Design a protein around this ligand. Structure first.
Ligand SMILES: [Zn+2]
Ligand SMILES: [Zn+2]
Lengths: 66, 33
């Protein structure tokens, strides 16, 4: 998701503002496939770095998790 | 071909990172009992 030749710039599932190319983005891979600013989720930069590096790990939105 | 992935909430991602930083576990998917 978000790697095609024709993706729109995606709005953050929390703040509605665009998740730009120079911002950390996190994709909900639980189900929804919504994008979010890392900042908006509350995830630390270190946690984001570790989670994005691990092939067997994905992130889930607070909605999807409930 | 099927694969198991582990799904982390923000809380769990942050907690897992703390566990790695505290040298309690090797990686954020180093689950244990
Ligand atoms: Zn946002
Ligand atoms: Zn979601």
């Amino acid at each position: 998701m978000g790697h095609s030749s024709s993706d729109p710039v995606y709005p953050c599932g929390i703040c509605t503002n665009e998740v730009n190319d120079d911002q950390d983005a996190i994709l909900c891979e639980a189900s929804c496939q919504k994008f979010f600013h890392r900042i908006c989720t509350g995830m630390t930069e270190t946690a984001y770095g570790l989670l994005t590096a691990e092939a067997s790990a994905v992130w889930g939105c607070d909605t999807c998790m409930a | 071909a099927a694969k198991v992935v582990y799904v982390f909430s923000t809380e769990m991602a942050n907690k897992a990172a703390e566990a790695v930083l505290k040298g309690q576990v090797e990686t954020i998917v180093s689950f244990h009992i």
